[PDB]
Design a protein around this ligand. Sequence first.
Ligand code: FMN
Ligand code: FMN
Lengths: 413, 407
Amino acid sequence: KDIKVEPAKGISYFTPAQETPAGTAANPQTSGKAIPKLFQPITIRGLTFQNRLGVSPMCQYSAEDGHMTDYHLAHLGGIAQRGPGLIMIEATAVQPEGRISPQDVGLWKDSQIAPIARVIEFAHSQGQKIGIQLAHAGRKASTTVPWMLNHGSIATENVGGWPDNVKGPSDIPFSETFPRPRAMTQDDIREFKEAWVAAAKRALVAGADFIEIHNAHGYLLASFLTPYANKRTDEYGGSFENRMRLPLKIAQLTRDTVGEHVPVFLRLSASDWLGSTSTETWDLQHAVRFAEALADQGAIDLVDVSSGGLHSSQEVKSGPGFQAPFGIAVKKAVGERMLVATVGHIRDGKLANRLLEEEGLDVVLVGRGFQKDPGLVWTFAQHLDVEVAMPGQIRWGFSKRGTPFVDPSVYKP
Amino acid sequence: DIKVEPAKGISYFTPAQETPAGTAANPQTSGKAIPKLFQPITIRGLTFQNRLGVSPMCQYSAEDGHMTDYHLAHLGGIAQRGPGLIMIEATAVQPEGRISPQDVGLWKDSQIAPIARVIEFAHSQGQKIGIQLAHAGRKASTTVPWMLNHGSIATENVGGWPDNVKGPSDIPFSETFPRPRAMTQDDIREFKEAWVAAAKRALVAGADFIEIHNAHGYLLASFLTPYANKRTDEYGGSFENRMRLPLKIAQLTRDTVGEHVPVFLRLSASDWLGTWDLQHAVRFAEALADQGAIDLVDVSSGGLHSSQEVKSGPGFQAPFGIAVKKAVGERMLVATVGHIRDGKLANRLLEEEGLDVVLVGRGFQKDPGLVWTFAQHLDVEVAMPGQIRWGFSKRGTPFVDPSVYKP
Ligand SMILES: Cc1cc2nc3c(=O)[nH]c(=O)nc-3n(C[C@H](O)[C@H](O)[C@H](O)COP(=O)(O)O)c2cc1C
Ligand SMILES: Cc1cc2nc3c(=O)[nH]c(=O)nc-3n(C[C@H](O)[C@H](O)[C@H](O)COP(=O)(O)O)c2cc1C
C-alpha cells in the first residue's frame, strides 16, 4: 500500500536494506527438505554467519602504501553482494617491512583504516560479516607481485622494496631468489607485538567483525615454528616448546585486544610437503600439536588449516580437497574445544557439505573459486538444491513472487 | 627488475592492465579460429574487445538520481571480468522521467561524479562503459520491482510524483499505473532540451557511448505506440507523426555527441498482444538506417502495453533482431538480448544469423564472470586481470587456459 524502500541502517550513504541477508537459506524450505550443514548458520562469540562458505583471504597486490583504493570495493563488494557466510580481507601488514609485496594492504598507520572501512561498510550494508587477516611476511617479505614476469624475485628499493629490512627468526633465506632475513632481536619482537596490538585496534575501528592471525605460508610465526628456519638459541627457539612461544603470545594478545565478543581465528600450515627426511620437518603431527596447544590456551576460536609455503623445496600434491585431510586430522585432536575450517580446491557444494557432515568440520573456505565466480554461494546452493536469499537488486529478475529466496531450479548451469 | 605500472588517467593507483579482460589471444594457442563472439568490434573510433556486453540493468539503489558505493561494487566486479561493453542503467534526463524515486539521473550536475567514479574504474581496467539515457513517460513514479507493492504507483510519501507524470497522452498504462498528462509542445521542447543537457554531462562522466531507451512502453516508445500516442498534433496520428520525437532525439543525440562517439537505440520489437509489431519495428528501424544517426539498434520487446503476453525462452527475442538485421544489412549494427545463457547459442546468433553484438542482462547478475564462462563454452582463451588469473596458472600470458576450473 505505502510500502517504502527502507535504507540500510548505519551506513554513511543510501542503499536499500536487505532484510534477509544474501546467503541465508530458507529455514522452512519450500522443498520440505532439510537444509544441509553448508547452509546452516554458525554463531561464534557474539557473531552469527548465515552459512559456512567463507571467502578465504586473497592478496590483490593493488594497494598504495598499504591503502585500499576503489579497486578493492569493486573486488570485494561484488563478492559480498552475493552472500558468502564470511569474507576475510587479504593479509594486512602489521609493520611496513612485513608486507609481502610493496602493493600489500597494511594497517600500521591510521590513514589505512578509512580505505578498508569503506569496503567493510559496504559488506555491512548488505548484512554480511567481514574480517581481516593480520599478517607479517617474515623472511618472505619485499618480494615481487606475482603476475609480473619478475614474479618470484626480490623487490628492490627502486620498486618500493626493502631488501635490507627483511626480518625473521634467524638469518637463513627462504630461497636463493628470496632476500636475506635479519635475525629479529628482542627489541624487534617487542615492537612486532606492540605493532600487532596496534594493528588489531585499527581493524576494530575499521569495523572488522573478526580477526585472523596469519601463522602460515612460511611468512613468520610459522617460520618461528619450522625448525629449519629458526636456529635461535634463546627462549624463542631450540625446543618445540620454545618455537611456539611467540605464536602463542600473539594468540593471547589478539584475544586480549579484541575482548570476549570478537571471534579470533588462526591460519596455520599443516605440512611443508617435504619428502621422506630424517631431520625435523613441519609434519601433520607438529601441526596437530600446535593446534592442541592452542585449544589448551583458550584464546583462538577457530583454526584455519592450510599448508605449504614453508620450505623452498616443497612438493605439494595439489588436487580436489587436497588439504582437507589435514583439517580433519586437527578436528579429531581438538574436537569441540575449537572450530576448524578447511580450504583448498574445494570446487563444488557436495564436497563442501560432506567435509562438514561426514568429515565433521565447521567452515569451508574458498579462494580462487570466488575470484572466478563471485556467485559461488548461489552455485553451491544450486549443487545441494538449497533455496537461498539474494539481494533485491539481483533476485527479482530470477522470479515467477515476493520471497527473498531464489529457486535453485532457475538459471541452472 | 620490472616495475608494476599504475593505470593511466586515474585518480588513484591500480595495477595497469596491458591486455584488457575479455580480450582473446590473437594467435590462439590451439590454432582454433576466434569465434565471432570474441572477435573485436569497432564503431566510429571506439573498439570493443568482444561482442559480449552487459545489457542496461536498473538497480533501484540511487538517491536523488545519484549513484553510490553500491554501483562501484555492482558494475566494478562485472567490468573486472572483461565484458566487451558495459551499459549503465537507464539514466533519467528529467526527474519526472525516472521509473522509480531510486533511479539514476543526469538532469543535474551533482549526478556526474557519482556516475564517473564507476566509469573511471572500468577505464582503469581497459573496459568500455556507456550510459542509457531515458524517460519513463507514462510508466514513471512507479514502485521498485522487488517490493511487494510492485506494479504500483509511487506516492509523494515514497518520494513519487503521481501528478507530474507526463506521456504522449492521458492514456494510462493500467488501473494500477499512474494517470499521465499529455505533454504540451513546450513540454516536448523542454524534454528534447533536457536530453541534450543529459548527454552533455554523460560525456563529462567519461561515457564511451550513449544508448537511447526507445522501448518498454516509456515516452519514446509510448509515442510510437498508437494506443498511447493520439495527440492529433504533428506528433499524433500518422506512423510518421509518431516517429518524429524518436527520430528527432536520435539526430539530437548524434548532434550533441561527436562523430567519434557511438550512439545506440534500444527498441521493443513487439507488444506480444497478437499494434506495435516486428513490421512497425522493421519500419522504424529502416527510418533509423535512413537518418544514419544511430550506429546500433538494440532489439528487445515488451513493456509497450499492459495485457501483453510475452513468450519467454532461450533467445526468445533473437528472431526479432535477425529480421531487423535483414531489413538493415550493413547500414546499421544490430544487438540481440533475451535469455542467451550460453556462448554456443550466442556465437551462432552472431555467425549463423549475422548479428553484431550479443547482450546479456541477468546472466551477469548471477555470474559477473559470464565472459569467462562463455569462453570455456567455446574453448576460447581470454585475458583476465593479473589479480584474478595468476592463481589459475600452471604463467605470463594474459590469457587463461579455458580448461582450468571448468565446471
Ligand atoms: C590470488 C591469491 C591471494 C591469496 N592471498 C592470501 C592471503 O593473503 N593470506 C592467506 O593466508 N592466503 C592467501 N591465499 C591462499 C588462499 O587464500 C587459500 O589457501 C586457497 O587455497 C587459495 O585457493 P583455493 O580456492 O583453491 O582454496 C591467496 C591465494 C590466491 C590465489
Ligand atoms: C534488474 C533489471 C534491470 C533492467 N534495467 C533495464 C534498463 O535499465 N534499461 C533497459 O532497456 N532494459 C533493462 N532491463 C531489461 C534488460 O536489460 C534486457 O531487456 C534483458 O532482460 C536482458 O536479457 P537477459 O536478462 O534475459 O539476459 C532490466 C532487466 C532487469 C532484470
